[PDB]
Design a protein around this ligand. Sequence first.
Ligand SMILES: CCc1c(-c2csc(CCCN)n2)[nH]c(C)c1C(C)=O
Length: 103
Amino acid sequence: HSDLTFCEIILMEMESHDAAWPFLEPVNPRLVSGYRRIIKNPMDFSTMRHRLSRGGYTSSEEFAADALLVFDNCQTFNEDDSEVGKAGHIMRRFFESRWEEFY
Ligand SMILES: CCc1c(-c2csc(CCCN)n2)[nH]c(C)c1C(C)=O
């Protein structure tokens, strides 16, 4: 629980980031046609927050994998020059920068 505090900090910094707006909650299939058809494993920051809050991450590596899944999904579905596409690249580098401050 307490040993993952730094992942909690990274998640908060991600949630508070200017480019985080597409990723705060799960993508709504009634708003994005066929999204979950194309993306088998959706992921978002609120889902990660709830998993951290219940102690559902057995390692920091599992948390990092969910973070990358947010950005891999975004790059799979969104054009690179779209608003969400741009935000995903910005956020991926932000996450990578924070991760390499510990690893
Ligand atoms: C463009 C739709 C989209 C949003 C989006 C657009 S507007 C918004 C804010 C909702 C309220 N916080 N999210 N996000 C993601 C990851 C999307 C896709 C297709 O991948």
